[PDB]
Amino acid sequence: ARKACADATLSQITNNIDPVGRIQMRTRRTLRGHLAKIYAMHWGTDSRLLVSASQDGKLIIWDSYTTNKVHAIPLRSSWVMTCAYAPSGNYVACGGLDNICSIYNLKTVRVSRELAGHTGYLSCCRFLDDNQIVTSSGDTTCALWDIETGQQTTTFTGHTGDVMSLSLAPDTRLFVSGACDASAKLWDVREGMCRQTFTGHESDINAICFFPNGNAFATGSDDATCRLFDLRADQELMTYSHDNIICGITSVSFSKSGRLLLAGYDDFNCNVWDALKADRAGVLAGHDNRVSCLGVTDDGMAVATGSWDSFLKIWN
Amino acid sequence: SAEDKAAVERSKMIDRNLREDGEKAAREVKLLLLGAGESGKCTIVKQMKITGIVETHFTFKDLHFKMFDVTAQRSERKKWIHCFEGVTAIIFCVALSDYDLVNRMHASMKLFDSICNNKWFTDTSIILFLNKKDLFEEKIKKSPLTICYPEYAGSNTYEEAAAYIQCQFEDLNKRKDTKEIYTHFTCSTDTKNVQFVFDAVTDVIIKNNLKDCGLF
Amino acid sequence: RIKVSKAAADLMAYCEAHAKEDPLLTPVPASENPF
Amino acid sequence: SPYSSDTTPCCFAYKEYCYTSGKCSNPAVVFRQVCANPEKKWVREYINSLLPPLYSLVFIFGFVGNMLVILILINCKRLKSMTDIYLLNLAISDLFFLLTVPFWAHYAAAGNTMCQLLTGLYFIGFFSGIFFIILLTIDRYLAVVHAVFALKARTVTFGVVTSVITWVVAVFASLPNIIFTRSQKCGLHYTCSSHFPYSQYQFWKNFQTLKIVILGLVLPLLVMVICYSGILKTLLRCRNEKKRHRAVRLIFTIMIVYFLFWAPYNIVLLLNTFQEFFGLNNCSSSNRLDQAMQVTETLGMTHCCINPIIYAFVGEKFRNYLLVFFQ
C-alpha cells in the first residue's frame, strides 16, 4: 500500500533547511519577431539556440545570447502547439493539428520528413536522441518514432483522456506524461511497458517535467496546484497550492538544483515555488497575455518564458 | 565583429520576410467550421472555386477565404479550441433534418452553445448555416417537429419551422450586443452559398475596422 | 517501493549539494553572465 | 497669425526702420510714424539703405494627451495596423502645434532665423495635422466602404509613403511664409512679424489667404462629409441598435467640433485680409480683430489638444490598452 509507507512528509523534513526567500528576477531581454500566440518551446544543451512555434505558420530559431533569428521555417500548418529541439542541434520537431510531427534539419533550412500516423492532435514532442523521437498526440496514448525509418516503433497507451505533455529523464531512459484523467504514467523507452501511474490530481494536467536527478517529477494541473511525484515512493510527494491562485497551469519546469519550481499559470504571469518548503520565491511578470510555454537552460544560465503576446523574456 | 555583423544582417533579412508573410495573414480571412452530429463541414466544400484538419483555399471577389474542418479531431474541444481565436468568422453548419435521429439537434445546440458562450470566442462572429434544406421539406409532412422541441409554434409549416429553428439559436447566444451571429439557409446553387459568406465576412471586417478606427 | 522519508531525504540531499551550482538560486556575476 | 507677437501697428492712412505685419491691408513702411510710401519712394529707399493660466494648462493637457497616445502604440499596438502610424504622426504634428507657445513666451520679455524656423514649425505642424485628419478620414472611408480593398491595399509601407508625401507637401505649402518673413524687432522687446515683399502685396496676400482658408475648411470638410456619408450608408445596415447609434453620434460630434473649432479662424482671416467690410477704422477694427485672432488660435490649439481624445479614446479597444499599460 502507498499510504502504509507514508510515515512522514517532505515539508516536515525540509523545514529544517534554510528557506530561499525572495529572488531578484528581472527581464534582461525580450524576444520580438513573432506575430501570433506561442504555445511551446525547447532549450538546447548548449543554451545558445532557441526554438519557438507560433500560430502565424513560422517556426523560427532564436539566438538567446544576441536576440536574433538564425533560421526561418515556413510551417505548412499555422495551427501548431508543440515544438522540440534535438540535443544534437541538427533536427527540430514540430507538430500541430495535422496529427503530424514534421522534422526540419537545420544542418543543410530544409524539411527532412513529416511523420504521420496519429489520430488525435499532437501536443508534445521530445527528442530522445538524434535518431529516436517520442511524440504526444490526442489519442490518449503516446508513441515512439524514428527519423530514419519514419514509422511508429513503440506505442504507449493506458490513459483514458488525451495527453498534452511529456518530459524526458536526464538519461533518456524513462518518460512521464499527463492527461485529463489526472494520471501521470511512467513508461520505459526500451521495454515500452507502463511501470507505474501517478494519479491524485483533481483536474486536467497540462504541464509535466522531470527532476534533474530523475528520481522525482512534478506535474501541472488546471486546479491551481502542482503535485510532486517521486518514482521511489510511488505516490504524491508534496503539493504546491495557494488560495490566491485559482487559474490553471500550462508550463512547469525545474532548475539545475531543483530548489525552485517555475510554474506558468493562467494569470498572465509566472510564479516561482520552492520545491522543498512550498514557499513562493518570486513572481515572473511582464507578459500582457496568457503564458503557455516555459523552459530552463540545461546549464542553468537563464530561463525563457513565452506567452500568447508573441514575446519571450529571459530571466537570470 | 565580422561574425556578429553577419548574424544581425541575416536576421534583418528574416524579419523582412516575416513582415511580408505576416501581412498576407491580415488580408486573408480565417473561417472555422465545426459540427456536433457530423452535419458541419459539409456541402460547402463542393464549390466550383474550391491530414488532421481539411484546409481549403479560394478567392472570391478579390478576397481569399480559409476554412478549417475539425472532424478527425475526436479529443476534447477545450484543449485546442483556443487556437482558433481571433479569426474573422466561424461558419457553423447545422442540418435541419438532424432533429429526429439519435436527439441530434440537441447535441448540435449543446456544441453550438459551448463555442458561442466560450470565453475565447466572444470577439469573433459566428456564421450559422441550415443544411439539408431540400430534405427538410418532405420530412415535416411525415415527421412532426414536436419530437425535437416541445413547442413547435402550432403552425407545423416550413415558414414557421425554419423561423423557429433560426430564432431559437439566438437563445443559446448569451451575448447579443457583444457578439453578432449570422443565419442563412443554404441553397442548391454553389455560388449563392458563398455569396452570403462574402457578404457576412466583408461585414465583420467592417466591424473590426470601426473598432480599430475608434468608432466602436 | 521504499519509505517516503528515505526518498524525501535523498531529494533534498541532491539539491543541497547542487545548490552551489544553481545560477537561479545563487546569482551569477554580471560579467560571467552572458546576458 | 503665428502668435500674438505678429500684431504690429499698420499705416492705415497715408527715425527707425521697421516692417509691418501681413494682417493689414494697404501696407506702408513705418518711420512717430511718417508712412510716406511702401514703394516708389526715394526717401523710403534711402532709409532702408542703412487667460494666460488657462492657456498653459490646456497646453499641458494637450501635451500629456499627445505623448500618451504616442507611447501607447509602441507599448501595445507596436504600429502593426496601418492607421496607427497616421494617429502617431498626427500626435507628433499636434506636438509641433503646441510646443511653439512655450518658446513664444521665452522669445519675448528678454533671432531672425530662429523666428523663421519657429513659425515654420508652427505652420508645418498645423498643415500636417490638417492633412493627417484628412488622411484618417480617407482611411476610415476606405476601411468601411472598401473593406476588401482596404485589406488588399492598406500596407504599412504605403502609409509611410503617404505620411512622407504629406510632410513634404506641408513643408512646401509653408515655404512661402518661410521665404517671405523677417524678425523685424524694431523695439526693446522681441517681436516676430510676417512681411510680404510688397511687389504684389495685394495679390500675394490674397493668394496666401485663399490657400490657407481652402486647405483649412473646404478640403477637410468636403473629405469629411464624403467619407462620413459613405460610412453612414454602409453602417445603416449594421444590425446593431447601440453600436450604430453611437458611431453616427460620434461622427456628427467630430464634424461639428471641427467646424466650431476651425471655421471661426478662417472667417476672421477672410474678414481681416479682404478688408472690404471694415477697413476705414484704424484701431477700432484692429484691437477687436487681434483679440478675435487670439481667441480663434487658442480655440484651434484646444482642438489640436482634443484631437487625440476624439480619435483614440472614443474607441473601446483603445481604452483597454491604457488600463493594461497603467497596471
Residue numbers in the entry:
A (entry chain B): 21 to 128, 133 to 340
B (entry chain A): 6 to 55, 182 to 233, 241 to 354
C (entry chain C): 27 to 61
D (entry chain R): 1 to 14, 25 to 41, 47 to 65, 128 to 187, 192 to 408
What did the original publication write about this model?
Using the optimized CCR5–chemokine proteins, the cryo-EM structures of MIP-1α–CCR5–Gi1 and RANTES–CCR5–Gi1 were determined with an overall resolution of 2.9 and 3.0 Å, respectively. The maps allowed unambiguous placement of most of residues in the receptor, chemokines, and G protein, except for the N- and C-termini of CCR5 (residues 1-15 and 314-319 in the MIP-1α-bound CCR5; residues 1-32 and 314-319 in the RANTES-bound CCR5) and the N-loop and 40s-loop of RANTES (residues 15–24 and 42–46). The extracellular ends of helices I and II move away from the central axis of the transmembrane helical bundle by about 5 Å in the RANTES–CCR5–Gi1 structure relative to those in the MIP-1α-bound structures. This alteration is most likely associated with the different binding modes of the chemokine N terminus, in which the residues Y3–D6 of RANTES are adjacent to the extracellular tip of helix II while the counterpart in MIP-1α shifts towards helix VII. The third residues in the two chemokines vary in their side chains with alanine in MIP-1α but a tyrosine in RANTES, resulting in different binding modes at this position. The bulky side chain of the RANTES residue Y3 wedges into a gap between helices I and II in CCR5 and makes contacts with Y371.39, V832.57, and W862.60, leading to the outward movements of these two helices relative to those in the MIP-1α-bound structures. Accompanying the outward shift of helix II in the RANTES-bound CCR5 structure, the chemokine residues S4–D6 occupy a binding site adjacent to helix II and ECL2 and form polar interactions with residues T177, S179, and S180 in ECL2. The residues S4-T7 of RANTES mainly form a polar interaction core with the receptor ECL2, while the counterpart in [5P7]RANTES packs against helices I and VII. In the structures of MIP-1α–CCR5–Gi1 and RANTES–CCR5–Gi1, the N termini of the chemokines adopt a ‘hook’-like conformation, which is stabilized by a salt bridge between the only negatively charged residue in this region (D5 in MIP-1α, D6 in RANTES) and the positively charged main-chain nitrogen of residue S1. Additionally, in both chemokine–CCR5–Gi1 complexes the side chain of the N-terminal residue S1 forms a hydrogen bond with the receptor residue Y2516.51 and the main chain of the third residue in the chemokines makes a hydrogen bond with E2837.39.
The chemokine receptor CCR5 plays a vital role in immune surveillance and inflammation. CCR5 exerts its physiological functions by binding to multiple chemokines, such as macrophage inflammatory protein (MIP-1α, also known as CCL3) and RANTES (regulated on activation normal T cell expressed and secreted, also known as CCL5). Here we report three cryo-electron microscopy structures of Gi1 protein-coupled CCR5 in a ligand-free state and in complex with the chemokine MIP-1α or RANTES, as well as the crystal structure of MIP-1α-bound CCR5.
